[PDB]
Design an enzyme around this catalytic site. Structure first.
Site, PDB file in Angstrom:
ATOM      1  N   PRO I  11       0.684  -1.364  -0.159  1.00 45.86           N
ATOM      2  CA  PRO I  11       0.073  -0.259  -0.192  1.00 45.86           C
ATOM      3  C   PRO I  11       0.969   1.463  -0.007  1.00 45.86           C
ATOM      4  CG  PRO I  11      -1.050  -1.682   1.457  1.00 45.86           C
ATOM      5  CD  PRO I  11       0.505  -2.088   1.496  1.00 45.86           C
ATOM      6  N   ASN I  12       0.414   2.445  -0.621  1.00 45.17           N
ATOM      7  CA  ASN I  12       0.874   3.649  -0.498  1.00 45.17           C
ATOM      8  C   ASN I  12       1.808   3.973  -1.319  1.00 45.17           C
ATOM      9  OD1 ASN I  12      -0.958   5.096   1.542  1.00 45.17           O
ATOM     10  ND2 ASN I  12       0.196   3.749   2.905  1.00 45.17           N
ATOM     11  N   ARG I  19       3.137  14.032  -3.851  1.00 42.00           N
ATOM     12  CA  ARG I  19       3.232  15.292  -2.912  1.00 42.00           C
ATOM     13  C   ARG I  19       5.072  15.828  -3.220  1.00 42.00           C
ATOM     14  NH1 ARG I  19       4.891  14.659   2.308  1.00 42.00           N
ATOM     15  NH2 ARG I  19       4.877  16.934   2.347  1.00 42.00           N
ATOM     16  N   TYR I  24      10.676  14.265  -1.800  1.00 43.81           N
ATOM     17  CA  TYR I  24      12.100  13.171  -1.601  1.00 43.81           C
ATOM     18  C   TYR I  24      12.143  12.421  -3.006  1.00 43.81           C
ATOM     19  CZ  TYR I  24      12.837   7.742  -1.803  1.00 43.81           C
ATOM     20  OH  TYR I  24      13.193   6.870  -1.910  1.00 43.81           O
ATOM     21  N   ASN I  76       8.055  -5.467  -1.495  1.00 42.80           N
ATOM     22  CA  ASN I  76       8.268  -4.537  -0.980  1.00 42.80           C
ATOM     23  C   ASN I  76       6.391  -3.926  -0.233  1.00 42.80           C
ATOM     24  OD1 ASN I  76       7.956  -1.928   0.511  1.00 42.80           O
ATOM     25  ND2 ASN I  76       8.687  -0.942  -0.987  1.00 42.80           N
ATOM     26  N   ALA I  79       3.579  -0.558   4.320  1.00 45.95           N
ATOM     27  CA  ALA I  79       3.087  -0.601   6.089  1.00 45.95           C
ATOM     28  C   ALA I  79       2.807  -2.140   6.653  1.00 45.95           C
ATOM     29  CB  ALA I  79       2.057  -0.026   6.122  1.00 45.95           C
ATOM     30  N   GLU I 100      13.047  -9.532   0.110  1.00 43.59           N
ATOM     31  CA  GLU I 100      12.050  -7.869   0.703  1.00 43.59           C
ATOM     32  C   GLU I 100      13.226  -6.800   0.476  1.00 43.59           C
ATOM     33  OE1 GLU I 100      10.905  -9.235   5.159  1.00 43.59           O
ATOM     34  OE2 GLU I 100      10.254  -6.613   5.023  1.00 43.59           O
ATOM     35  N   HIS I 102      12.869  -2.051   1.652  1.00 37.30           N
ATOM     36  CA  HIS I 102      11.931  -1.761   1.614  1.00 37.30           C
ATOM     37  C   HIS I 102      12.904  -0.001   1.259  1.00 37.30           C
ATOM     38  CE1 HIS I 102       8.933  -3.141   4.535  1.00 37.30           C
ATOM     39  NE2 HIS I 102      10.494  -3.727   4.604  1.00 37.30           N
ATOM     40  N   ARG I 109      13.620   4.710  12.339  1.00 36.77           N
ATOM     41  CA  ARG I 109      12.608   5.132  12.570  1.00 36.77           C
ATOM     42  C   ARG I 109      11.608   4.688  13.515  1.00 36.77           C
ATOM     43  NH1 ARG I 109       9.304   5.023   6.180  1.00 36.77           N
ATOM     44  NH2 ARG I 109       7.767   6.704   7.788  1.00 36.77           N
TER      45      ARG I 109
END
Lengths: 146, 146, 146, 146, 146, 146, 146, 146, 146, 146, 146
Positions: I11-12, I19, I24, I76, I79, I100, I102, I109
């Site tokens: 997601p996302n 934006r 970024y 990836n 969340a 995996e 990211h 974080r």
């Protein structure tokens, strides 16, 4: 009476010297207050002391100090360092840098004494050097400004 | 010809004042040692210092301090305070009392820096007051020999 | 030249018999090593021994031991049992079986001593039996090989 | 009887060598007990054994053991290491010293097996050396009295 | 004014009876006082009492009690038992032994009520038995003075 | 003559390809180095390497790296990642960006391997991919420098 | 004296507006009180306000709230929410319903701020909406009464 | 004499039906057994049953079951699921598979009831379906043996 | 379809470059996808991509991948790595190896992001290396197939 | 829409009022929505609403809001508050400030409901005030926008 | 951060000023260093120092010096001048110009001190002048670099 340094003692510290008295020292709180005052005065610095067993007294005093322009607190909150958020927010709220002092070595005793609601916000912490920790704290305090 | 007091600096303290010397000063470890020696010299107390990045070298020095009759150790273990049980056992094995000192306020940083393998067996602890921390430890140490 | 069995002593064990021998005793590490040397010799086995306060010296020795063809290790990691993953991975790296020995009863002391990075991979463990734990471990190791 | 040394086996140890007799071998609680009895016979010491799956029977046997003047207990409590405060307090209450013994490496198994209600009061502990664990504890006890 | 035994009730205990009586009858704090006053008198033992909702007040009381030569304290700290180290440090600072009392069974309530800063230092603790707990405490107090 | 990229290998990585070359290949640490040396020679990048079993040797090397102007560090701390705060403070102390590499998947191993004293300050991390993890990291380093 | 609704402001809230008013506005505890008084009376409802830095003062006020027939309390316990079980036992002892307010978003801050001895026994909680949080609480209070 | 399926009921299950019963049912242990015994005969399977309040009895019973050539066990350990490692090792020792059963839904009750020293080693678990849970295991055991 | 390799995005991630393209950067998911597809095409490998904000969609896609004969999955989870046991059981259930990935350094974080429900089952993991993470994972994937 | 404010209701909020009305009350989601749409119109602010039981739908809507130029979200995430990182990362990805609303007092129910993956990132949080929570949130939201 | 000039002191020069400060002054090696540090700080030159009793440490340092770009070396090899060909080959190997300094007049001492393994490759040599020989050399170094 506007102090430029305030030294605050938390609960049960009035009982220094009162019990025994050679248990671990015939030294009293007043002795310690006087020494510090003379240390201050020999650096041409005004210094107040306060002690109470009542948490709000200490909080009110901390508020009073910000209007007086007290530049730095030296504080031995005793048992209140494991308990009072109120105190942390008091010091934080007014923005008076502070130095934390403890007479005995807090890390050598029960595990609940290893938690503090102030240490992460202090400039620094002195513990386990008895009364001298106060002198040291003030020493640093004197140089900090001048 | 031995030293009544030994000062020990742990890993990475050799880097003091070498990077962007506005970052946290030009104060070097050598600077600090001279102020400490000079300060020991006024009290007629002999003082040696030691630094290394190797835990085993610091363990050896402490064993050597027993042989030379060091009476008190002032130790900035830096990061080894969080990880090194061998250093604890050196200090207890040789049975020399010590004062723990850190330049920064350890309580104001990462949670893992709140665990020490030393602090509970120290006479006491100073953290946050920069270099002066050492001088206070010395001042303390001195009166305890005196 | 070479050795079937290698004994490895951790940091600080060089201090045995050194301080206040009235309470602690006069048994030195050398003494212990000669006793084990004799024990191994009586049973026609080769035995080498090693001690360092430097963790990397011990890892290196463990690597050399693989080259030498050591069949089994008896180790007193001392304080490294609670901290050194590097030592664990050394032992598993070389794939030489080992037995863990501690002089004092580790379970009877602070809680941090209750954790071990090696114990789960030892053949077995001996703690609290003083120096005889090495003998017993050696006695186990002799039987195991011949 | 009486005896100078008492060897307790906790629950389930009576199943040794009974099933799958090739894999975990043919050795049995029975065999073990003969071996130890004879090791005591040959050092002219009187040895008693005991095994029950009943906790109270073990605690009772321990009270029995006090009155008879048992000098040292060598106890493999098996499962009850992890669960019996009763067994801990029986031993403390009759104040006979003991050595904790386990056939397998307790640390190499489930985490719930990493807790012992006895270890921190034992003289010492031995795990993972199979049958010889017992033999070593007996050997230690012998040379502790005589 | 002044006494040889002290009973202290912490915050909210002054509301016994007053919270419309159906929930736990008409029994008040002052009824319990007057019952203890009598049990005290009848054994030629003075007994003072004190209640406040200010932790500070109660600390002062404990200190003041040291002057008065109070030989034991029977206390219901109420909420304070879970929060007040200062209270703990008062009773240890003065070194007056104490019994801790609670009307309700504290272990049958929210999990945070399971912690106490006093109970480990108490002679002993009674809870769940209501006001008769106070009288049992007083009963034991007397029997051990003479 | 200074290197722009320094590759650092922790304890036991020297053991690669040594025992039972059936185990994860015949690949030696030297092979990995040479594959990396050649890759950097194609991008006209100067690369250095270092390996040791002693923590302090590695911390020294990082300090030296600062002096010689290293721009980026690729580090396989191996075991030192779980244990070494000094290595953390060395990398932060010199303020050289790094990438953390592991050969095996750490997350698929024991829980104590899930903790890193370095990862949170790395640019990035690669585990599980064997030797190519190092190439990927160089590939990444190179792109970031021009 | 009496009041239908009582707003209780906790420790340090007296400091709203009294330091660098561009950190968080000139909005003061008095200005909040007055707006709420306005709003309350425009609903033809009686509202009394209170503020202490003394936990025991607030507990007393709350006991007195029961006697003067207060129907609902709107309380910002400030820092006492994380510490005060006595404040909890008070509000429950008087069995007066209440609503908990916090100016800032308490979840956005230190983790010790995330636990409350009040929240679960409140009717609801507002936090992070500053002074309007007090207003919304009163809105809902007035509706719950009229 | 000799069996194939063994049912074990732990401590307190003897009290079923005895009190009132409108706690839920009039049902008794004996009722369940006769229901289970009947079910088995319909499948030409022989089934014995056992209940006890003593951990050792049950242990003994599991050992005898291996002697009898019991192919499967249906056990309701009751509270012993949360405490007896002995029972676990009994079952694994004799290596007879087993089904764990609980009358009431364990997970809806106190948090210490969420723990089992058996569940990870049973073939399965049924909780909260009453005495019928026993029948379901029995059915299951039947077609795994047929 | 068919594809040898599948790149799944959680997601996302569809928000990449959407934006304030200088927060970024301007890189988009579709850009990432074209680069990988082309990379695969240069090695004569078919690769397909998939993103969704719906957990079921991704679980379905992974099931679809088993039917398609997908060899390796690059994923990836964004969340979902910290929350989605279902996606773990999906990957395990089709039994397709996976890597995996990211974009950002997850260990730098919040602590809830340190925990992952896939990492321990993946071949390896790459984090904090931006979109180049995927390309590296693809490069590893390709030499694992070809 | 394009809308200025967006009210998002998570899973299960559609059941409001359906089941057994007289123990929760008659208020349905459509009522809430009607009331907010009214409140909003009265101030000339456009307000769209959205409910789903699917997490990915909420996430999509949140991405749709950004495109639509939505200025603030009022979200009652319901169960997703305790479980959905994806939701957290959606709202932070679109960089739209939000207010979290909960109809019941969340802190009064199971411990697991005390943790939120959203609360620390909201402007503020309202819980336990029923539907008014939504209106207050809208009040605040309007006076922030207008 | 690299030094343009490196000053190197050989074996036993650490002994300066230690014994019988009547002997050639109270001047320590550290004093000499600091006089040199200050002189180089006046010419805006960066100077480093190093001393060791181990030849290999000194050879390492010279190699490192090459890497970091040292322009000139001032070396007091002390005893190593008569014996160390390796030190010669180190200085030639890195091709860094040096000046050789001795405190005492070597020519006025034993004949074996008249041989140097370094002098013929130095730029120049200074003996007999005590500490100023080092200043003179720096003075000389500085002028040659700009």
């Amino acid at each position: 009476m506007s102090s430029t340094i305030l030294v605050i003692h938390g609960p049960n510290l009035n009982l220094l010297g009162k019990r025994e008295p050679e248990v671990y020292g015939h030294l009293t709180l007043d002795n310690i207050n006087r020494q510090l005052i003379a240390q201050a005065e020999q650096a041409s610095i005004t210094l107040d002391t306060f002690q109470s067993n009542w948490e709000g007294a200490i909080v009110d005093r901390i508020h009073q100090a910000q209007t007086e322009g007290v530049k730095l607190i030296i504080i031995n909150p005793a048992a209140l360092t494991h308990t009072s958020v109120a105190l942390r927010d008091a010091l934080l709220g007014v923005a008076i840098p502070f130095i934390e002092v403890h007479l005995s070595n807090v890390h050598a005793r029960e595990a609940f004494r290893h938690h503090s609601y102030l240490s992460d916000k202090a400039i620094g912490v002195i513990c386990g050097l008895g009364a001298k920790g106060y002198s040291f704290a003030l020493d640093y305090a004197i140089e900090k400004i001048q």
